[PDB]
Amino acid sequence: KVFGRCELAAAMKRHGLDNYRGYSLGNWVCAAKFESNFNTQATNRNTDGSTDYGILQINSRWWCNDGRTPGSRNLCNIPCSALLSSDITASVNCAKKIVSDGNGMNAWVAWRNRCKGTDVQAWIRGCRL
Numbered sequence: 035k036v037f038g039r040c041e042l043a044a045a046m047k048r049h050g051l052d053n054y055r056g057y058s059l060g061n062w063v064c065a066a067k068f069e070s071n072f073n074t075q076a077t078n079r080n081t082d083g084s085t086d087y088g089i090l091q092i093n094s095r096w097w098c099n100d101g102r103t104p105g106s107r108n109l110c111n112i113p114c115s116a117l118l119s120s121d122i123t124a125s126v127n128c129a130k131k132i133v134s135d136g137n138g139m140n141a142w143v144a145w146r147n148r149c150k151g152t153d154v155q156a157w158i159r160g161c162r163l
């Protein structure tokens with residue numbers, strides 16, 4: 035599923051992402067825009083053999099199990115395919131664990147390079163919420 039910008043903002047807010055760990059909703063919408071272009075089915079292979087999954091491009095190196103990243107962790111205790119569902123519940127719950135691990139949203143390379151320090155509120159402008 036490819037979300038609309040305001041559709042995704044609503045779903046993230048319903049699942050309690052808005053200001054989670056101090057990150058306003060626009061931060062999460064911006065991150066998903068640049069990690070996946072709002073596509074819950076996005077996947078990308080990393081150079082070390084791991085893979086990033088779903089609308090927030092969560093990495094199998096640490097967070098999910100895909101059966102093909104030897105030596106990795108599954109800290110969210112989910113199959114990576116659960117991060118590709120049209121329902122973002124699993125991605126949100128895993129993102130809450132990631133952002134709580136001490137580094138905040140710097141765990142998302144696209145947020146760090148393309149959202150951090152910008153006017154992220156622009157990403158929820160015009161949505162009802």
Ligand SMILES: CC(=O)N[C@@H]1[C@@H](O)[C@H](O)[C@@H](CO)O[C@@H]1O
Nearest residue numbers: 086091092093132141142143144
């Ligand atoms: C929280 C998380 O899994 N972030 C990943 C990061 O691990 C990876 O290096 C990158 C590759 O483009 O995509 C995502 O930002």
Ligand SMILES: [Cl-]
Nearest residue numbers: 058059060155
């Ligand atoms: Cl915001």
Ligand SMILES: [Cl-]
Nearest residue numbers: 101102103104
């Ligand atoms: Cl594995």
Ligand SMILES: [Cl-]
Nearest residue numbers: 045120121122
């Ligand atoms: Cl949803």
Ligand SMILES: [Cl-]
Nearest residue numbers: 056137138139
């Ligand atoms: Cl922080």
Ligand code: NA
Nearest residue numbers: 094098106107
């Ligand atoms: Na893993």
